[PDB]
Amino acid sequence: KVKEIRELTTAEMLDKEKQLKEELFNLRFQLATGQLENTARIKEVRQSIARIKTVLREQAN
RNA sequence: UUAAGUGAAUAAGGGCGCACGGUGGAUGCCUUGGCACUAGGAGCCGAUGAAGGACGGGACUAACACCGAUAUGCUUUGGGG
């Protein structure tokens, strides 16, 4: 959801950031080659990256 | 039978009236926009980068809207069920 993000330190924040990046790259490729039953995840990953970034923003000033 | 005289009707096509269609959108009714004002708010925006724009953002994306690499959306405080 939203609250589990607030628990982790800045290290885990950047970790999950890079992990979501990689997942987005894989979703991108597997789009072009006729796959990905559940395409509604291409929203979730971008929105989660957004949430992580803003929550990071509010802490660092 | 001869002779003299009289002489109707038919339409290649056209006129008039009637009856039935075809093109064309007047007229009848109607409003999704306008016009002129009344009362009240408001009367500036900009080097923290303006007005206005180009390019992009969706499973599909040609356009219009909204958005901006956090891109058809992020956080929080109230409403709603």
PDB file of C-alpha atoms (C1' of nucleotides) in Angstrom:
ATOM      1  CA  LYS A   1       0.000   0.000   0.000  1.00  0.00           C
ATOM      2  CA  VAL A   2       1.417   3.339   1.173  1.00  0.00           C
ATOM      3  CA  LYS A   3       2.329   2.801   4.815  1.00  0.00           C
ATOM      4  CA  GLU A   4       4.858  -0.002   4.350  1.00  0.00           C
ATOM      5  CA  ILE A   5       7.054   2.450   2.433  1.00  0.00           C
ATOM      6  CA  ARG A   6       7.384   4.755   5.443  1.00  0.00           C
ATOM      7  CA  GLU A   7       8.953   1.991   7.549  1.00  0.00           C
ATOM      8  CA  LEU A   8      12.222   1.496   5.668  1.00  0.00           C
ATOM      9  CA  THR A   9      15.368   3.600   5.717  1.00  0.00           C
ATOM     10  CA  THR A  10      16.810   5.460   2.753  1.00  0.00           C
ATOM     11  CA  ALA A  11      18.936   2.450   1.801  1.00  0.00           C
ATOM     12  CA  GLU A  12      15.941   0.169   1.297  1.00  0.00           C
ATOM     13  CA  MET A  13      14.257   3.036  -0.541  1.00  0.00           C
ATOM     14  CA  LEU A  14      16.915   3.203  -3.246  1.00  0.00           C
ATOM     15  CA  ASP A  15      17.036  -0.591  -3.287  1.00  0.00           C
ATOM     16  CA  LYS A  16      13.354  -0.939  -4.075  1.00  0.00           C
ATOM     17  CA  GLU A  17      13.736   1.885  -6.574  1.00  0.00           C
ATOM     18  CA  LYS A  18      16.286  -0.007  -8.643  1.00  0.00           C
ATOM     19  CA  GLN A  19      14.299  -3.215  -8.298  1.00  0.00           C
ATOM     20  CA  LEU A  20      11.168  -1.582  -9.684  1.00  0.00           C
ATOM     21  CA  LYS A  21      13.281  -0.107 -12.473  1.00  0.00           C
ATOM     22  CA  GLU A  22      14.455  -3.552 -13.527  1.00  0.00           C
ATOM     23  CA  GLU A  23      10.931  -4.919 -13.347  1.00  0.00           C
ATOM     24  CA  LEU A  24       9.764  -2.102 -15.588  1.00  0.00           C
ATOM     25  CA  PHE A  25      12.456  -2.930 -18.131  1.00  0.00           C
ATOM     26  CA  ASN A  26      11.339  -6.554 -18.210  1.00  0.00           C
ATOM     27  CA  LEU A  27       7.686  -5.609 -18.572  1.00  0.00           C
ATOM     28  CA  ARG A  28       8.662  -3.347 -21.459  1.00  0.00           C
ATOM     29  CA  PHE A  29      10.494  -6.053 -23.363  1.00  0.00           C
ATOM     30  CA  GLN A  30       7.914  -8.763 -22.743  1.00  0.00           C
ATOM     31  CA  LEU A  31       5.298  -6.398 -24.109  1.00  0.00           C
ATOM     32  CA  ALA A  32       6.821  -6.304 -27.576  1.00  0.00           C
ATOM     33  CA  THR A  33       6.968 -10.086 -27.945  1.00  0.00           C
ATOM     34  CA  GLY A  34       3.329 -11.039 -27.431  1.00  0.00           C
ATOM     35  CA  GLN A  35       3.148 -11.876 -23.729  1.00  0.00           C
ATOM     36  CA  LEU A  36       2.069 -10.300 -20.433  1.00  0.00           C
ATOM     37  CA  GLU A  37      -1.392 -11.564 -19.620  1.00  0.00           C
ATOM     38  CA  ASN A  38      -1.662  -8.974 -16.816  1.00  0.00           C
ATOM     39  CA  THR A  39      -0.762  -5.654 -18.394  1.00  0.00           C
ATOM     40  CA  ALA A  40      -2.371  -3.667 -15.623  1.00  0.00           C
ATOM     41  CA  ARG A  41       0.890  -3.918 -13.715  1.00  0.00           C
ATOM     42  CA  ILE A  42       2.572  -1.349 -15.957  1.00  0.00           C
ATOM     43  CA  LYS A  43       0.639   1.246 -13.983  1.00  0.00           C
ATOM     44  CA  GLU A  44       1.378  -0.179 -10.554  1.00  0.00           C
ATOM     45  CA  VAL A  45       5.130  -0.102 -10.955  1.00  0.00           C
ATOM     46  CA  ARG A  46       5.313   3.480 -12.162  1.00  0.00           C
ATOM     47  CA  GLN A  47       2.929   4.646  -9.447  1.00  0.00           C
ATOM     48  CA  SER A  48       4.882   2.808  -6.768  1.00  0.00           C
ATOM     49  CA  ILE A  49       8.096   4.425  -7.960  1.00  0.00           C
ATOM     50  CA  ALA A  50       6.300   7.748  -7.741  1.00  0.00           C
ATOM     51  CA  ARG A  51       5.214   7.110  -4.169  1.00  0.00           C
ATOM     52  CA  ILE A  52       8.674   6.039  -3.070  1.00  0.00           C
ATOM     53  CA  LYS A  53      10.225   9.126  -4.625  1.00  0.00           C
ATOM     54  CA  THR A  54       7.824  11.633  -3.079  1.00  0.00           C
ATOM     55  CA  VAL A  55       7.962  10.034   0.358  1.00  0.00           C
ATOM     56  CA  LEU A  56      11.715  10.314   0.016  1.00  0.00           C
ATOM     57  CA  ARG A  57      11.297  13.970  -0.880  1.00  0.00           C
ATOM     58  CA  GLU A  58       9.278  14.917   2.184  1.00  0.00           C
ATOM     59  CA  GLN A  59      11.889  13.455   4.535  1.00  0.00           C
ATOM     60  CA  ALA A  60      14.927  15.092   2.919  1.00  0.00           C
ATOM     61  CA  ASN A  61      13.629  18.595   3.587  1.00  0.00           C
TER      62      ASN A  61
ATOM     63  C1'   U B   1     -73.809   0.239-113.048  1.00  0.00           C
ATOM     64  C1'   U B   2     -72.691   5.253-114.377  1.00  0.00           C
ATOM     65  C1'   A B   3     -73.010  10.628-112.871  1.00  0.00           C
ATOM     66  C1'   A B   4     -73.131  14.867-109.551  1.00  0.00           C
ATOM     67  C1'   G B   5     -72.678  16.347-104.613  1.00  0.00           C
ATOM     68  C1'   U B   6     -71.703  15.659 -99.309  1.00  0.00           C
ATOM     69  C1'   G B   7     -68.195  13.401 -96.128  1.00  0.00           C
ATOM     70  C1'   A B   8     -67.186  10.751 -90.597  1.00  0.00           C
ATOM     71  C1'   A B   9     -62.976   7.955 -87.957  1.00  0.00           C
ATOM     72  C1'   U B  10     -57.537   6.498 -86.782  1.00  0.00           C
ATOM     73  C1'   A B  11     -51.617  10.730 -84.017  1.00  0.00           C
ATOM     74  C1'   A B  12     -44.777   9.911 -85.802  1.00  0.00           C
ATOM     75  C1'   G B  13     -45.586  13.649 -82.010  1.00  0.00           C
ATOM     76  C1'   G B  14     -47.927  17.969 -79.089  1.00  0.00           C
ATOM     77  C1'   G B  15     -51.658  20.951 -75.803  1.00  0.00           C
ATOM     78  C1'   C B  16     -55.187  21.177 -71.047  1.00  0.00           C
ATOM     79  C1'   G B  17     -56.999  18.982 -66.663  1.00  0.00           C
ATOM     80  C1'   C B  18     -56.587  15.131 -63.357  1.00  0.00           C
ATOM     81  C1'   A B  19     -53.749  11.177 -60.536  1.00  0.00           C
ATOM     82  C1'   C B  20     -48.830   9.115 -58.675  1.00  0.00           C
ATOM     83  C1'   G B  21     -43.529   9.276 -57.961  1.00  0.00           C
ATOM     84  C1'   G B  22     -38.187  11.622 -58.191  1.00  0.00           C
ATOM     85  C1'   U B  23     -34.615  15.338 -57.219  1.00  0.00           C
ATOM     86  C1'   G B  24     -34.384  20.204 -53.469  1.00  0.00           C
ATOM     87  C1'   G B  25     -34.572  21.576 -48.731  1.00  0.00           C
ATOM     88  C1'   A B  26     -38.700  26.395 -47.853  1.00  0.00           C
ATOM     89  C1'   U B  27     -41.845  26.333 -44.121  1.00  0.00           C
ATOM     90  C1'   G B  28     -44.034  24.471 -38.718  1.00  0.00           C
ATOM     91  C1'   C B  29     -42.194  22.999 -34.057  1.00  0.00           C
ATOM     92  C1'   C B  30     -37.370  22.307 -31.010  1.00  0.00           C
ATOM     93  C1'   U B  31     -32.352  23.761 -28.442  1.00  0.00           C
ATOM     94  C1'   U B  32     -26.737  21.575 -27.093  1.00  0.00           C
ATOM     95  C1'   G B  33     -24.975  28.334 -28.296  1.00  0.00           C
ATOM     96  C1'   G B  34     -25.369  33.777 -28.417  1.00  0.00           C
ATOM     97  C1'   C B  35     -26.759  39.228 -27.416  1.00  0.00           C
ATOM     98  C1'   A B  36     -27.701  43.394 -23.674  1.00  0.00           C
ATOM     99  C1'   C B  37     -27.616  44.161 -18.827  1.00  0.00           C
ATOM    100  C1'   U B  38     -28.238  43.876 -12.861  1.00  0.00           C
ATOM    101  C1'   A B  39     -25.879  42.741  -7.810  1.00  0.00           C
ATOM    102  C1'   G B  40     -21.309  40.960  -5.668  1.00  0.00           C
ATOM    103  C1'   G B  41     -15.800  39.358  -5.909  1.00  0.00           C
ATOM    104  C1'   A B  42     -11.627  40.602  -8.389  1.00  0.00           C
ATOM    105  C1'   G B  43      -8.434  44.336 -10.936  1.00  0.00           C
ATOM    106  C1'   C B  44      -2.086  42.303 -12.548  1.00  0.00           C
ATOM    107  C1'   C B  45       1.732  38.312 -14.180  1.00  0.00           C
ATOM    108  C1'   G B  46       7.194  38.071 -14.398  1.00  0.00           C
ATOM    109  C1'   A B  47      15.360  36.301 -13.381  1.00  0.00           C
ATOM    110  C1'   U B  48      12.247  31.308  -7.796  1.00  0.00           C
ATOM    111  C1'   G B  49      12.144  32.245 -15.552  1.00  0.00           C
ATOM    112  C1'   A B  50       6.186  34.874 -17.258  1.00  0.00           C
ATOM    113  C1'   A B  51       2.021  35.131 -21.657  1.00  0.00           C
ATOM    114  C1'   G B  52       2.138  31.782 -25.600  1.00  0.00           C
ATOM    115  C1'   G B  53       3.831  27.425 -27.532  1.00  0.00           C
ATOM    116  C1'   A B  54       6.903  22.622 -29.612  1.00  0.00           C
ATOM    117  C1'   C B  55       7.666  17.546 -28.180  1.00  0.00           C
ATOM    118  C1'   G B  56       5.857  13.658 -25.429  1.00  0.00           C
ATOM    119  C1'   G B  57       2.355  10.397 -21.629  1.00  0.00           C
ATOM    120  C1'   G B  58      -2.537   5.220 -22.330  1.00  0.00           C
ATOM    121  C1'   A B  59      -3.388  -2.248 -24.178  1.00  0.00           C
ATOM    122  C1'   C B  60      -4.948  -0.377 -28.646  1.00  0.00           C
ATOM    123  C1'   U B  61      -3.613   6.430 -30.101  1.00  0.00           C
ATOM    124  C1'   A B  62      -5.486   9.786 -35.835  1.00  0.00           C
ATOM    125  C1'   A B  63      -7.614  14.120 -33.085  1.00  0.00           C
ATOM    126  C1'   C B  64      -9.639  17.030 -28.564  1.00  0.00           C
ATOM    127  C1'   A B  65      -9.164  17.470 -23.657  1.00  0.00           C
ATOM    128  C1'   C B  66      -5.764  16.662 -18.641  1.00  0.00           C
ATOM    129  C1'   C B  67      -0.886  15.730 -17.484  1.00  0.00           C
ATOM    130  C1'   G B  68       4.801  16.326 -17.772  1.00  0.00           C
ATOM    131  C1'   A B  69      10.698  11.677 -17.615  1.00  0.00           C
ATOM    132  C1'   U B  70       7.109  11.002 -10.414  1.00  0.00           C
ATOM    133  C1'   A B  71       3.665  12.338 -17.549  1.00  0.00           C
ATOM    134  C1'   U B  72      -4.643   9.726 -18.465  1.00  0.00           C
ATOM    135  C1'   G B  73      -0.853  11.220 -12.593  1.00  0.00           C
ATOM    136  C1'   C B  74       2.287  11.587  -6.264  1.00  0.00           C
ATOM    137  C1'   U B  75       1.344  13.412  -0.677  1.00  0.00           C
ATOM    138  C1'   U B  76      -2.002  15.437   3.109  1.00  0.00           C
ATOM    139  C1'   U B  77      -6.588  17.595   5.295  1.00  0.00           C
ATOM    140  C1'   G B  78     -12.129  17.807   5.072  1.00  0.00           C
ATOM    141  C1'   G B  79     -16.728  16.159   2.098  1.00  0.00           C
ATOM    142  C1'   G B  80     -19.264  11.296   0.115  1.00  0.00           C
ATOM    143  C1'   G B  81     -20.941   5.952   0.688  1.00  0.00           C
TER     144        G B  81
END
